[PDB]
């Protein structure tokens, strides 16, 4: 009726909106010669991901949490999860090494031109793209997701369609650990960091300017730091916290924070992209 | 400018042997090098050639298991191994700077050369000796078995007018340029497949042995030269 | 007294100006409209060359028309291939302030000048493959704006000392010294006889030497502005001054005073540069605004935008035959223009 | 002084611009417009050519 | 086709060294000396060390600068100026030695004045905009001997002396009189107040008080480029 309906006009103007807005972001960077800055590959590597995962995993979760079913067959499920995975983890670290070259960028102002050259952020990109693919691969092509719990696997995997992801202690823990917590560590300290620097600039420049006769730098962290935990933080607490319970939560809740996921997936070129000056007078040049 | 070269002589078949070559007076670092064969009773014959920066390293169509090649610019030597020779390569070994870039001369200078002894394009030489006096033409023709025309324009064809007792020289490059120290008493012209040399006025300096050679493909081949006798 | 010679002296001024504006009957406009229009084209751009770092200041083209050479801000030049797009030469200056460049009419020899205030002169082709310095000019109080070639032996200089002069390479110091002018002088163009030139300074006024004569022949009312850059029409009787009034001008040597005007209510930003094509037909410039606009050499109107540049253009310059037309910017980036 | 020597060298190089019977300007623009007319046939940019003796293709 | 790819091998030959002199370009900072003939610029110079301008070169913590001093054309820099403008910083050089007793030969009038209304003239330029100028106040030890040798006082041809005193905020390192605490600030304030009248906060000026002989300086540079740099850093990503 109405509800199901109502889904797939959300779920058809969400793909929508994060298709066009990658394929804008991409355009706009592929072919200008005054936008060849690292910082500006490591955007484009960024929306290339996020185009991925709109083009490639959104529509069929579209179908798997609509229909409550798995038409698509067994052999489909096998390369979604780990497709959606992969992407995950790479815009997770795009992001972590954006903040990581901010850092060197804003606290190291003399010594920045000669440590971050195309050599460094290339191995970055090479980096990001690597490591998440063979982890997701060996972790659920190779039976490592649920090996310890085999007929809890099945009773979990009892479910919409078939293809539900279910996670172990060890598993759940780990995964925790190495995609969400570092990087979230990295990015307080580096913007905890920058947010001191710019405060006490701002007041000696405040100070002597109002002698002689925190708004933009709160504003913008808290803006984008609100924008990042705001929705993959809530998804991570309860992936880990559902294995130590005893697996009592609503397939619903499971859906609504992957939704959420794929929202701050849309949101991400919106904040690093079309916030600055720079690339929208470039944009409105044409 | 100056090209010295050792090595070379007698030794036993299946032996290893050692060549050197080494430039003194001008900076060779920018140079391409050809190593280059001359058999006793035959023509000129390239044997290896080596890029400005190693990129680039050809050898030997007839024979190429055999022979290595290396350089070094702090040293500046361009030295060669042989391994397992035989009768065949018994020829005069030279070593030749060339620089390639547009309007270039290349082959400008060539060595004193070293003594060893123990299909493609190919050119032949209709005459073998053709004897006339000091004061008529002399008319010397080449003929090749493809159009050395490119599709830039350029007529690959080189003369040597190489003299009896010295080391050989460049005359006319790409069929249509003079050269630097040359006299201005030699011309040439061409169609693509017929070629000639012409020569006015005759002097003493003038005996020698003249050679044909294209850089359309790369074989590296040569004419088949003539000798004049006064 | 001085007062009265002074006095003699501006009467004598104002009725020469008198005799010259009596010496005009009729502008060319009015023939001008006897003329068929040209037509508007949007060539576009053919190659493009990206060698340099800093700014590029000056170019030359070759007498082959197919070779060229540049100057940039880093302190080094480079021979491009105009076919190819290959880097035939690379070669590093001793000061990297320079703002001149020249190339030699037989392609032997290069230029260099700027705020160092000595002229070098190199030697392309030598016994060895790389190049060296030949000769080192000095005497000069003044940073250099153009270094053209007179011949294979015969170098004139512009410089900021508000004198030029002819210099010779052999015996290394100047033949000839012209001198007149109040301000800095930055422009300097040649004849296809070799015979005359015409410079420009800061202090609007364009003053025609002949080489041989030794001292001024010509003298021309400017703009209202400096003379960033001239050119010299390839028949021989004219040329075009190029300033920071938005406004370009052109005057004829045998009538000795102005012919055209090219101005426009859009454009604000001063010339930098000045060329014309083989015929004679159309007139390039360029300006701050980030585009060669392309003029009209009869009617005084554009004909194209013809923009492609991120920064401002500094030079540009058309082959001995009209093949095609280089240009270089400020952001390091040559393109060849058909 | 150089001040007085330079208004003389002045002097003189004005009576000798007077001197130099500058032509009318109706020549000029003649001879200007008869040289365009008879030059603009071998020159590119004006005319363009087919792509085939171009030495820039592309 | 031989000939076309040893060309191409030349050009890739030519396109790495190239890449080298990027590579070496890009560390280095550019610094813009300006100052007048009475000044001890030389002397300037000559300290940091340890026929056209003249170049040198030194090197702090690991960074390389390029500084231009500038012995060069007529007193005209309307045209040669447009070349400076991706150098770093601008040190100008001040004398803080002329008294309204010695005003001038036969041009103006005491060179205090000639120095500021020069100061102004580059501060006001156009070409010169987001450049900041590091401010100098040299030659501070015969201030300090003239203000109390007599037989000169500035208050003569300066009638806003009387009406100044020294600020709260003043260091008082000389410990010898506040005189000279009083007039070296009168001095820097006076530059302060030509210098910040316009920018629009995209550069600044930072005064300081140099002699010299001294020994200093080079941390005082490099500690004005560092913020120099860091501000700009900050305002691009919207940080201040
Ligand atoms: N793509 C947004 C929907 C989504 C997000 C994350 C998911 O699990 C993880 C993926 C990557 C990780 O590094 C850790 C966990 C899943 I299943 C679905």
Same mark, same amino acid.
């Given at each position: 009726?109405?509800?199901?309906? !109502?889904?797939?006009?959300?779920?058809?103007?969400?793909?929508?909106?994060?298709?066009?807005?990658?394929?804008?972001?991409?355009?706009?960077?592929?072919?200008?010669?005054?936008?060849?800055? %690292?910082?500006?590959?490591?955007?484009? *590597?960024?929306?290339?991901?996020?185009?991925?995962?709109?083009?490639?995993?959104?529509?069929?979760?579209?179908?798997?949490?609509? $229909?409550?079913?798995?038409?698509?067959?067994?052999?489909?499920?096998? &390369?979604?999860?780990?497709?959606?995975?992969?992407?995950? !983890?790479?815009?997770?670290?795009?992001?972590?090494?954006? *903040?990581?070259? @901010?850092?060197?960028?804003?606290?190291?102002?003399? @010594?920045?031109?000669?440590?971050?050259?195309?050599?460094?952020?290339?191995?970055?990109?090479?980096?990001?793209?690597?490591?998440? =693919?063979?982890?997701?691969?060996?972790?659920?092509?190779?039976?490592?997701?649920?090996?310890? =719990? $085999?007929?809890?696997?099945?009773?979990?995997?009892?479910?919409?369609?078939?293809?539900?992801?279910?996670?172990?202690? &060890?598993?759940?823990?780990?995964?925790?650990?190495? !995609?969400?917590?570092? %990087?979230?560590?990295?990015?307080?300290?580096?913007?905890?960091?920058?947010?001191?620097?710019?405060?006490?600039? =701002? @007041?000696?420049?405040?100070?002597?300017?109002?002698?002689?006769? $925190?708004?933009? =730098?709160?504003?913008?962290?808290?803006?984008?730091?609100?924008?990042?935990?705001?929705?993959?933080?809530?998804?991570?607490?309860?992936?880990?916290?559902?294995?130590?319970?005893?697996?009592?939560? %609503? %397939?619903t809740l499971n859906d609504v924070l992957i939704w959420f996921g794929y929202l701050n997936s849309t949101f991400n070129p919106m904040v690093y992209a079309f916030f600055y000056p720079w690339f929208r007078k470039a944009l409105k040049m044409m | 400018v100056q090209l010295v070269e050792s090595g070379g002589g007698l030794v036993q078949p299946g032996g290893s042997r050692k060549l050197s070559c080494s430039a003194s007076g001008f900076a060779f670092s920018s140079f391409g090098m050809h190593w280059v064969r001359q058999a006793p009773e035959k023509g000129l014959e390239w044997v290896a050639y080596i890029s400005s920066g190693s990129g680039t390293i050809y050898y030997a169509d007839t024979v190429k298991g055999r022979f290595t090649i290396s350089r070094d610019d702090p040293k500046n030597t361009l030295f060669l191994q042989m391994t397992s020779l035989r009768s065949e390569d018994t020829a005069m070994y030279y070593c030749v700077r060339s620089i390639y870039y547009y309007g270039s001369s290349p082959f400008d200078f060539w060595g004193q050369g070293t003594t060893l002894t123990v299909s493609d394009i190919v050119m032949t030489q209709a005459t073998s000796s053709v004897p006339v006096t000091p004061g008529e033409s002399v008319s010397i023709s080449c003929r090749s078995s493809k159009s050395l025309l490119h599709s830039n324009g350029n007529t690959y064809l080189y003369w040597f007018l190489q003299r009896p007792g010295q080391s050989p020289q460049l005359l006319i490059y790409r069929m249509s340029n003079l050269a630097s120290g040359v006299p201005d008493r030699f011309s040439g012209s061409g169609s693509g497949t017929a070629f000639t040399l012409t020569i006015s006025r005759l002097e003493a300096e003038d005996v020698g042995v003249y050679y044909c050679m294209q850089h359309l493909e790369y074989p590296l081949t040569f004419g088949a030269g003539t000798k004049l006798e006064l | 007294e001085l007062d009265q010679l002074r006095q003699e002296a501006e009467q004598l001024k104002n009725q020469i100006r008198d005799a010259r504006k009596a010496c005009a009957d009729a502008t060319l406009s009015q023939i001008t409209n006897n003329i068929d229009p040209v037509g508007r084209i949007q060539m576009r751009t053919r190659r493009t060359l990206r060698g340099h770092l800093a700014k590029i200041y000056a170019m030359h083209w070759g007498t082959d028309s197919r070779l060229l050479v540049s100057a940039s801000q880093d302190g080094k030049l480079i021979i491009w291939d105009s076919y190819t797009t290959n880097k035939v030469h690379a070669i590093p200056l001793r000061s990297s302030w320079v703002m001149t460049c020249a190339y030699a009419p037989s392609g032997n020899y290069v230029a260099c000048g700027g705020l160092d205030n000595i002229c070098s002169i190199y030697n392309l082709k030598t016994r060895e493959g790389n190049v060296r310095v030949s000769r080192e000019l000095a005497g000069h109080t003044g940073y250099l704006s153009c270094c053209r070639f007179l011949d294979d032996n015969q170098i004139v200089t512009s410089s900021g000392d508000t004198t030029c002069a002819l210099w010779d390479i052999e015996t290394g110091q100047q033949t000839t010294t012209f001198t007149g002018h109040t301000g800095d002088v930055m422009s300097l163009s040649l004849a296809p006889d070799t015979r005359l030139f015409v410079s420009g300074a800061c202090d609007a006024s364009a003053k025609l030497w002949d080489v041989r004569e030794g001292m001024c022949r010509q003298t021309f009312t400017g703009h209202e502005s400096d003379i960033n850059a001239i050119c010299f029409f390839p028949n021989g009787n004219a040329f075009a001054t190029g300033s920071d009034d938005a406004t370009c001008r052109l005057f004829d040597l045998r009538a000795d005073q102005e012919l055209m005007t090219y101005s426009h209510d859009n454009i604000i930003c001063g010339i930098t540069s000045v060329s014309f094509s083989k015929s004679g037909r159309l007139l390039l410039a360029g300006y701050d605004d980030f585009n060669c606009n392309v003029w009209d050499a009869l009617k005084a109107d554009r004909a194209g935008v013809l923009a492609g540049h991120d920064n401002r253009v500094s030079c540009l310059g058309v082959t001995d035959d009209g093949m095609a037309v280089a240009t270089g910017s400020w952001d390091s980036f040559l393109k060849i223009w058909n | 002084t150089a001040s007085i020597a330079q208004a003389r060298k002045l002097v003189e190089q004005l009576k000798m611009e007077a001197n130099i019977d500058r032509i009318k300007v109706s020549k000029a623009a003649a001879d200007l417009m008869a040289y365009c007319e008879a030059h603009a046939k071998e020159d590119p940019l004006l005319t363009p050519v087919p792509a085939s003796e171009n030495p820039f293709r592309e | 086709r031989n000939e076309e790819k040893a060309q191409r091998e030349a050009n890739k030959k030519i396109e790495k060294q190239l890449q080298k002199d990027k590579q070496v370009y890009r560390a280095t900072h550019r610094l813009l000396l300006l100052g007048a003939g009475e000044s001890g610029k030389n002397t300037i110079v000559k300290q940091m060390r340890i026929s056209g301008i003249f170049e040198t070169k030194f090197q702090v913590d690991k960074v390389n600068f390029h500084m231009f001093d500038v012995g060069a054309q007529?007193?005209?820099?309307?045209?040669?100026?447009?070349?400076?403008?991706?150098?770093?910083?601008?040190?100008?050089?001040?004398?803080?030695?002329?008294?309204?007793?010695?005003?001038?030969? /036969?041009?103006?009038?005491?060179?205090?004045?000639?120095?500021?209304?020069?100061?102004?003239?580059?501060?006001?330029?156009?070409?010169?905009?987001?450049?900041?100028?590091?401010?100098?106040?040299?030659?501070?030890?015969?201030?300090?001997?003239?203000?109390?040798?007599?037989?000169?006082?500035?208050? /003569?041809?300066?009638?806003?002396?009387?009406?100044?005193?020294?600020?709260? /905020?003043?260091?008082?390192?000389?410990?010898? /009189?506040?005189?000279?605490?009083?007039?070296?600030?009168? +001095?820097?304030?006076?530059?302060?107040? +030509?210098?910040?009248?316009?920018?629009?906060?995209?550069?600044?000026?930072?005064?300081?008080?140099?002699?010299?002989?001294?020994?200093?300086?080079?941390?005082?540079?490099?500690?004005?480029?560092?913020?120099?740099?860091?501000?700009?850093?900050?305002?691009?990503?919207?940080?201040?």
């Open positions: 009726n109405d509800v199901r309906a !109502s889904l797939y006009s959300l779920m058809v103007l969400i793909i929508l909106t994060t298709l066009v807005g990658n394929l804008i972001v991409i355009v706009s960077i592929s072919h200008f010669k005054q936008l060849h800055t %690292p910082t500006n590959w490591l955007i484009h *590597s960024m929306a290339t991901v996020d185009f991925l995962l709109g083009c490639l995993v959104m529509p069929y979760s579209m179908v798997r949490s609509a $229909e409550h079913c798995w038409y698509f067959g067994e052999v489909f499920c096998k &390369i979604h999860t780990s497709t959606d995975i992969m992407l995950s !983890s790479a815009s997770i670290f795009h992001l972590s090494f954006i *903040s990581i070259d @901010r850092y060197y960028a804003v606290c190291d102002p003399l @010594r920045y031109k000669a440590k971050m050259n195309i050599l460094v952020i290339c191995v970055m990109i090479f980096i990001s793209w690597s490591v998440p =693919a063979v982890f997701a691969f060996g972790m659920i092509f190779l039976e490592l997701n649920f090996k310890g =719990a $085999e007929e809890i696997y099945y009773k979990h995997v009892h479910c919409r369609g078939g293809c539900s992801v279910f996670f172990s202690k &060890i598993s759940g823990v780990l995964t925790f650990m190495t !995609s969400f917590y570092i %990087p979230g560590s990295i990015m307080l300290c580096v913007y905890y960091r920058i947010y001191l620097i710019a405060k006490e600039q =701002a @007041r000696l420049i405040s100070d002597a300017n109002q002698k002689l006769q $925190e708004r933009k =730098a709160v504003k913008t962290l808290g803006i984008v730091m609100g924008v990042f935990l705001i929705c993959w933080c809530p998804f991570f607490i309860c992936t880990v916290m559902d294995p130590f319970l005893h697996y009592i939560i %609503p %397939p | - | - | - | 007529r007193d005209e820099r309307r045209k040669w100026i447009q070349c400076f403008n991706d150098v770093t910083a601008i040190i100008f050089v001040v004398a803080s030695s002329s008294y309204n007793m010695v005003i001038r030969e /036969d041009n103006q009038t005491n060179r205090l004045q000639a120095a500021l209304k020069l100061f102004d003239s580059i501060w006001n330029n156009k070409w010169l905009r987001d450049t900041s100028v590091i401010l100098f106040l040299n030659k501070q030890d015969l201030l300090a001997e003239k203000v109390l040798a007599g037989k000169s006082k500035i208050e /003569d041809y300066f009638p806003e002396f009387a009406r100044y005193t020294t600020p709260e /905020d003043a260091t008082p390192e000389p410990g010898e /009189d506040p005189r000279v605490t009083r007039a070296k600030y009168f +001095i820097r304030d006076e530059f302060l107040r +030509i210098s910040t009248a316009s920018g629009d906060g995209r550069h600044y000026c930072y005064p300081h008080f140099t002699c010299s002989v001294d020994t200093e300086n080079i941390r005082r540079v490099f500690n004005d480029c560092r913020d120099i740099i860091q501000r700009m850093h900050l305002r691009q990503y919207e940080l201040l």
